[PDB]
Amino acid sequence: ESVKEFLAKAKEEFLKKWESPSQNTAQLDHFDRIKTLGTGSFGRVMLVKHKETGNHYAMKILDKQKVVKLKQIEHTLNEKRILQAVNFPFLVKLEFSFKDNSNLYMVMEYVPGGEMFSHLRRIGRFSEPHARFYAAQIVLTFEYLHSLDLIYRDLKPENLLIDQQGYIQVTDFGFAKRVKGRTWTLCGTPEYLAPEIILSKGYNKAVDWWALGVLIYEMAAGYPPFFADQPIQIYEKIVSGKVRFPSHFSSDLKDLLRNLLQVDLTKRFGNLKNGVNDIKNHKWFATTDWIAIYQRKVEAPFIPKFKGPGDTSNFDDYEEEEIRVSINEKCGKEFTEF
Numbered sequence: 001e002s003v004k005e006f007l008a009k010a011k012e013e014f015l016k017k018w019e020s021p022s023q024n025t026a027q028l029d030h031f032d033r034i035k036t037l038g039t040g041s042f043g044r045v046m047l048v049k050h051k052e053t054g055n056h057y058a059m060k061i062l063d064k065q066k067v068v069k070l071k072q073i074e075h076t077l078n079e080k081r082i083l084q085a086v087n088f089p090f091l092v093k094l095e096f097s098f099k100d101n102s103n104l105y106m107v108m109e110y111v112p113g114g115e116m117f118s119h120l121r122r123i124g125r126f127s128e129p130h131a132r133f134y135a136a137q138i139v140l141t142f143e144y145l146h147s148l149d150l151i152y153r154d155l156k157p158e159n160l161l162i163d164q165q166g167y168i169q170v171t172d173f174g175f176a177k178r179v180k181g182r183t184w185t186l187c188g189t190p191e192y193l194a195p196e197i198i199l200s201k202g203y204n205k206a207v208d209w210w211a212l213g214v215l216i217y218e219m220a221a222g223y224p225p226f227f228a229d230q231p232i233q234i235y236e237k238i239v240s241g242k243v244r245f246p247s248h249f250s251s252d253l254k255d256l257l258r259n260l261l262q263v264d265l266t267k268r269f270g271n272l273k274n275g276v277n278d279i280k281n282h283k284w285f286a287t288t289d290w291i292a293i294y295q296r297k298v299e300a301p302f303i304p305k306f307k308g309p310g311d312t313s314n315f316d317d318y319e320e321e322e323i324r325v326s327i328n329e330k331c332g333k334e335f336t337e338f
């Protein structure tokens, strides 16, 4: 009942913000640009500093015209409406949002430890306890999101940032969506796609639990379970119903992963009658103190090295490009609600 009441309050608080979203809570010239932390086909993330408070933030900047061209309108509106309404210890917080004639802006908490992906590739693989510490945070985060009828749909090591305490902060809600029932959009990254996405079915929150299996495997092995050089070969392996496990995996880990990487979504852990509890009660999680993880009382396996809140050394280097704002409003209609 304590969990039921927690989730009921979480949903109430989410819905209040979901129904009346915040808008236009800062403007560009309140910030100094420091460094580009990441770039993509329609946007970028930059380290910025607030000129009056001195606080650092990560500012995601989306080019409205490119968002329209790449058919990402609904996805970007989803991302902002969801981020302004959620609140959970393992989600990067949205601090401000605004738009101008050219771009959409989401100003988030900066997480100087960088992406899990970088740390995983630098060390090779995580020990099972280390993988389990991160996995538990994802399980709780998905329990929270799913209780709000939210599907995340972009789990991968690049989207998990490691904070100053060694805990996970999930970022990039570009594919997150509120769904009661099914949804149909082809999205995700190839290695993490569930079979029902590849096969163009109407799919549901069970895709997140599949992706958790992929993530746990990749953390503990150092490479993802369906790896192949070409996407077509990845997809063939995903739908095949076969997975090979390193001999160093524990029997408990293999058993859990067989149940998360279950091709038949009606048999997949997280999607059975007992929901998330089939995962939380699995032997591989026997040592996990779920409340202590939520309360951030567990000592993390790894504290990222960084010098302070302005240190960018755990992110990589990109060509620094202008943030241009047109004299004329672009795509105003499409982004009215942002």
Ligand SMILES: Nc1cccc(C(=O)O)c1
Pocket (backbone or CB within 6 Å): 037, 038, 045, 058, 060, 092, 108, 109, 110, 111, 112, 161, 171, 172
């Ligand atoms: N999405 C994204 C990318 C890089 C850094 C951050 C951050 O919140 O620190 C977020």
